[PDB]
Symmetry: D2
Subunit: 275 residues, 4 copies
């Protein structure tokens, strides 16, 4: 059945379309550590023929202390994205945290992201909506998949129909997340079949890793419009998000598995196991 | 052991102090429906000798549609609070949703509230922190009680030590909340014994009521610094929050139970059941 | 509304009746350590005027290793109960794990208990049902309170209407339990108002204690037909159940709180907070 | 790393070995409806080259009423299995519910299954252990994967090292299950790498179906030793387990997907995403 299609330039992101990759790093540490990470992603996805979008946050708005590293900030962050654009010609996705950040950021990036914790705030959605940019909504850990149907409506109300839904796990007791593989279709269903992607790096959150490939495989096998991931040359030295970051050098072998599973799965004929 | 003390004028809010009431309505529908509700609360708490703070939100920032009733807005809302003040001489608590709302609102009310979903946003906390007002933090449904210790620190960093912690339930599967009666002490413990209150009306949330007295009794029996509640002359006609609102006429009999339980419990001698 | 009434000799156990105590120890370690524990319970409950039933298990059917201490066994266990009876004249409650144990045990004790994990096994219920003894059903950590309605029916089918329902917490993520204070009334409601008691010692289970009084207070404040508890002269030396055991010496001060809360709560007039 | 190997005749069931199928029906309704179902499974698995074991329960020990259909009973059930054996030459797996059923049943079947609710009962494990038969342990919905390590030990203690671990979901709030795709490896890890299979039909349990293929794909993509499933010519007419039963006619197309995913996944080179 007609899966909606959200296009990000030459890439068209859909559910029955081979998976698009929204990968990068957590925060824009240094213009140096970017170029590097971005460069590897481009090479690999280019070589494997995987649609690609580079992600990196420009401000950590919800850490633990008012003093913790938050990133280079909006202004400086835009500078880096611009170059990544000039230097590699990639599309970019980054999250915005306040209504007044939406356009300035849309002016620079291709996809603006609505953080999980602010997914229900009307003013941010609207500002984010009027921008006309492609939207990636992080599904709140505390909202059931059957409820994403409201958020997509909110955006349409604001004139934006380019919404992508991203699962990043659900609360499982205290300080724990579990990924409900059955949630993907529910989200699809209640959202007019909007594209559904899976953020494997945040779904692995405790309070990690040898399990990144396992969880990602599981999700991709369900049949998704895309995968969201973060990597790092050194996973336990980074400032912001800790483990759960995929080791940069492992990017290629990891993506071969994903593409392989996606191609196989997207290639299956329809199978109705209900009757 | 020394329970910290947060004072709101002539009321001093603490854990080993008879419970303070943060009660009112969900949203400032009409200056009319306020005066009324506020008037009943004052009369009853006055008569029963219950410390009291009137609560009402001035904007619904997280509803379901960009068009749903959100309240009278900041400006108009302040107008109503002012009168409630002039007409009854009460203290007021209301939630703020953006960093730029913190002072203007602190200028008018006695307690500013940090919504559950934005409890981890640094800029709001700081703005909210610099105001110097008394703070009521709604504990996120998705954060364990043992983590409230960070938020209190965030506020201190910003120069504010007048923080009250409020439990409003924890995610239990999808679209459901459960109240962990053991969380109250954990919150106490990790927060330098900050005052802990219980928002019984939001803890009853599905996707309600005959159970408001039951849940409230349970919480008060644990021994808390306060209770947070919302009422309405007509619980199923209100625009914003639905049921879970206590019927106004039932306020008095309800509070007699609470005070009775609180006085009895606060009156018990120390009981260490660990050794 | 008419709360059903289940009588255990001179004690009549009901929801609108002052709470009955089903307290004791986990396992029948030694005839020595029994007499002792049993003796203290009798003295205290006798002095406080609390209806009482002594509990102790005669076999640990679900430990971790085939070699772990399981208790004195059925035969030897009955011997000890008999004496406890002769020596103190108390009523007794113990759990049974197989259908062929039901009568032999009913012949000796006053209340037979259906373990949480076997609450849904038909043969055990029936054997347990035909015995005609008073039944205490431990609510499975994995079944919703709204489902206890089936189990009471199962017993009636087998000719037994003397069923008491006991809450012992619900699964909260992995290796954790949370007590839903709202479950008590649901259980009441779906079971023709059968008596509902709360097993505070098992509800405190991790993978404990300073919180026994807190949780117990919370539960008793809801208004229950009874409390289930285990104690020990030395809580961290016992073979079987670890902490969560109440220190024997603290029994009296603990029970004063419970009775006080129960008397106060059972004494309140009806309060309907739904309209 | 060496995955243990549990052999069931000419089939050797392991984690790095192509998946074995433990499929059939819920209960042995009629010798008629068996032959049929069994016949289709054999044909399909034979044609696809999928190792196969036929499953059917001979007694519903945990239904809702003492009168609900429970199956043909032990004796009569064995009769049917015998024929299924004579007529098709298949291996068989069935669950046992009491210690005295273990051998009589082992004498007839190839794999005996330990129900989820009785996974922690020592006497059943031992009886089940001494039998020397291959064991399939249903992981309790209420036990964390990290705990299966104890159960495998229990069996070894009883002299049985032919244990297969089967996931069938975990409690997610009330009346709901969620499948933690990360649990598979944890179970592997704490059990000396025992074979891990996934019971997709019971993992879909509410209080179902179009999602059977989706969930199964997800699990198989993680890389498992096997799949457990139940089917029926008519999924909503059956007496015992309702939906979640796969429509018999859909067996073949369903299994092609599974084999395809398994072969692809089992074929990948090692991928360590932790460093």
């Amino acid at each position: 059945m007609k899966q909606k299609v959200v296009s990000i330039g030459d890439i068209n992101v859909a559910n029955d379309l081979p998976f698009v990759l929204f990968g990068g790093m957590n925060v824009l540490e240094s213009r140096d550590l970017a170029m590097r990470i971005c460069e590897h992603y481009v090479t690999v996805t280019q070589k494997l023929g995987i649609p690609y979008v580079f992600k990196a946050s420009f401000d950590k708005a919800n850490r633990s202390s008012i003093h913790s590293y938050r990133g280079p900030g909006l202004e400086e962050g835009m500078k880096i994205f611009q170059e990544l654009k000039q230097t590699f010609g990639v599309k970019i996705i980054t999250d915005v945290h306040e209504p007044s950040q939406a356009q300035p950021v849309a002016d620079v990036v291709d996809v603006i992201q609505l953080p999980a914790f602010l997914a229900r705030q009307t003013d941010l959605v609207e500002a984010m909506a009027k921008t006309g940019a492609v939207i990636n909504v992080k599904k709140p850990q505390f909202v059931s998949p059957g409820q994403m149907g409201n958020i997509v409506d909110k955006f349409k109300e604001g004139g934006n129909e380019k919404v992508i839904l991203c699962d990043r796990g659900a609360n499982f007791g205290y300080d724990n997340l579990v990924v409900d593989m059955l949630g993907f279709s529910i989200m699809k269903k209640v959202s007019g079949n909007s594209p559904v992607i899976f953020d494997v790096t945040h779904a692995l959150q405790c309070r990690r890793r040898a399990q990144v490939a396992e969880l990602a495989r599981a999700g991709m096998a369900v049949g998704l419009a895309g995968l969201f991931i973060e990597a790092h040359p050194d996973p336990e030295h980074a400032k912001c998000d800790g483990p759960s970051a995929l080791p940069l050098a492992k990017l290629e072998p990891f993506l071969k598995q994903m593409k392989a599973i996606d191609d196989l799965v997207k290639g299956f004929e329809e199978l109705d196991t209900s009757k």
